[model samples]
Target: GIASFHPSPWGDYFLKYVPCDQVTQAKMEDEVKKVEEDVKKELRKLAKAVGKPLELLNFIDVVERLGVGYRLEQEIEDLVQAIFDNDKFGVDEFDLYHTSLWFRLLRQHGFHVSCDVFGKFKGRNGRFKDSLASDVKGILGLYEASHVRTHGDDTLDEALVFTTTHLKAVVTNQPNHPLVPQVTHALMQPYHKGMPRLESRHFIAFYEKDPYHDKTLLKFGKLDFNLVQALHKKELKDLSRWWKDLDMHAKMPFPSRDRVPEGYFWTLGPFYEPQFALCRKFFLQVFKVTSIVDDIYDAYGTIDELTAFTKAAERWDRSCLDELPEYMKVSYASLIDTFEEFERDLAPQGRSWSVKYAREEMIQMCRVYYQEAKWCHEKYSPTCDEYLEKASIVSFGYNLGTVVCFLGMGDVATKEAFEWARGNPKVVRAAGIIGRLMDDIGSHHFEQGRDHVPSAVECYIRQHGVDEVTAQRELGKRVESSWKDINEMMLKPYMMPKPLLTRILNECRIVDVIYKGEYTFSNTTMKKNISHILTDPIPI
Candidate 1:
């Protein structure tokens, strides 16, 4: 009874990297460290300089885009804190480029900055000054900066319309600017929402072509990217073997997407630094298994079969497996066994305590998925309000995955942090909203073609008596508002440390990228990006 889904494009493609040995990788990383040391020394010298504060902002921005920001995080944070303490907005003191760049860099680090700093840009008629359109780079900077705006940022909402309108106006001109590609890409994938490793591949080429690019920094950036890329290939190779050996497709004998590479790509968003290699490996197992279970609930199992599967998951026991249908047995066993495996693996690290919270979060998600499956079975039509409450709890398993990342994080996964994650607080709640809606919109047509549950779009239409276009429009507005909510959570007076908060925030960013314009998760849609990050080098 399972609907046929598109198979993953990367069959044994990653497993081909199995030949690379550790000796070569060790030497390459050793050389990378030398360049990192040199880059660190150069950055310290610049940070210590008193004269060129604005130039320092420029450095940090490219450093971020270059994907080397993780290497210099401490240095960059101290530098940003110094500038924020002495910050002042001059109606005319700084141009649009400097002001927007500073705002973006500051807010990205969780510093408390306001959109009111943009007060000077508006005209007496309450519109952005028409005279300001000529500075293409400044306009581009302003456009990129507005994405980090929080709720009630009416000025930023206005600025977004103004900048987008003007940018398109500029785009219509026949002869394009050199930065035209960057402008077009930004208009579609704002830097704030982009996955850094993927975007770095495109940005590095642009940076190299710039005549004013720093020689040492660009070289170091390429080397750093290469080292990270090399590390990822080994991880994927190992994971590919694990996926093959488990052979879940053969065991379940049901149609589910073979998307280990895509799932691995998803986890890289949260922990891309070289240090969290173990977290990436562990999280991918949970992500891949969750994807398979999603198919079982939505497309594969009978209602009775799913009811039993859901019950088995809630019980967290292998004994309940005998009650499930033949096809459901292996899936149920894997679900419980995976968490048990996490406990066994993490006990030596003194972090096995995290598996309890993660397991319960998983159980809670299954309860929501079961309810949704029942709605489709009974053909129940719920209001948008009703759908989102249960829908956000599932959060496509992203909120649970967020907690899983906290498991292996040393010292950062304090008891209080896990308690906060368990509460489904505002920012985490907003992420669930964003994830639910964006994914619902992305897969609306495809899902509706089948015997699937009513998505948010359908719920809105039937509840409010609107058309598809109207329902889609309303859901999109909610997505934007949710993004603003996420931005607000990033401001001062910490709920948890910035690193812990960053995990959830970064995961939200990837949802926009992966589901933008389409649901790119289960098919060939993400092949190019996966190849860029997992397979190709930056050609140093």
Candidate 2:
């Protein structure tokens, strides 16, 4: 292992060891510092132009437009950072006005409302009865908001009573309250500058246009949007207390945490870092706990099943893969189903194929190689062996990058081609080399069991007639060399989008550190690295 380490002002030590320092270490250090300063300057300029206050609004708009669920802290910070990276990106005039008002309202309430309740109702992390809880809370919040506008003042209990009463009346088709006009006026006036307020006509028009019959609310017992918003003018007066109580409750520990199971990584930041905002603080923990529960059923049903599942997934088909045990088939089936869900959610966002898609694609690639393994198993077809070798290597490259894609970008990889184009030649090749090495490391036991051939890293040097010691030394040199090459490339130019480049670089370090740690690149270690990438913000 290299002994040299670069002391960064950012507080983390980076590896810089080599056989000899051809470039003065001091000069190298200065160059890196200059680029970091320049990038920071550009980011600051963008932040000023976008206006820090409106930056959060942009992300809310994104959430509204694209129903991608995110950990609150990471999502908001990313949106803020992106706005700082691109000043021209912003909400439209109408949205901007309302977004401003909405934010102010949230601030006035101390931002204690759960996003699920205060805004749109998305599928809660499939763990727990989150959907049911969030739905109930959201309806109640809207009712309270309407009531406060009409009544001006009401106690929390009083508002709750009114909300409950109104809910019963709507459910039973009871006579409407008299405060309808005032309530409608308050809701519509905020939009008067640009468009007419939504009323009965607008509701009717909305239903007429909705292809999904989304406007009718429901034909069955399922909750309907109409039923939730059925407050008359007088009913609107009873909401002030509820809103106040909602804010007050945010100061209390959230009820959602109890639903989340143990040993989840998401709870670290998006879950725990709520000192930034009370409601946000409460919701973060709940969201992850919920997600962890969901993941249990979705990806890892049981610990026993998951342990075997990862093993099969990691084992590249170098031998008689077609005759692989029944356990692997079960694991593959579960994996496919989980990915299908990931794909469905990610597909609508227009990112094309995501990490889920990439996983499926890589699986199919392996299937082809396994078919060749079967050929070798039965008849020893030369074509199968030759084809499988090349296919497996290609699959490994795709698989390695796709794994990174899944951990960092999610379903985005499925839709977009993972072309790290104009990428550093040294780094790209180094990644492939590392992938070959890691594969050997993971399959060491399996390959021995099957008496399979040596790996590409071994075969390449063997063919080139390099000694084992020399090969090891050369690999170490290349790794150190690639590290510096990447460090240098980080400064070459700001040709592409700054936000994307910065995110990409941050993501690369996250995955790269796994191998750099001098440990086995197993799924467990990689998963921890993934958590860091997802939760931690990349400093500017």
> Which pairs clash (backbone N, Cα, C closer than 3 Å) in model 1?
none
**All candidates: CA RMSD in angstroms?**
2.7, 28.2
Off by over 4 Å in 2: 1-328, 347-360, 364-430, 438-450, 481-485, 492-512, 516-540
Tens-place lDDT digits, model 2, residues 1-540: 287433222111111112225465445445534543443344345445535544444334322212111213244445444533553543233231343334323322223222222222223542222333223323334343332121112232243344455444444452343333333432322111101112222333333433544221212111111221221111222222222233243333222222221111211211121121321222232233223223322331344444433445555232323444443442244344444444564566654343443454444444544443443345432322243255433433423332333323333332223444222234444444444444443343322423233343344444556755565566554444543343333342432333233333332333233343335433464354333322222221
Instruction: Provide the clashing-pair count of each candidate structure.
Output: 0, 15
**Candidate 2: residue 324 lDDT (0-100):** 43
TM-score of each: 0.94, 0.32
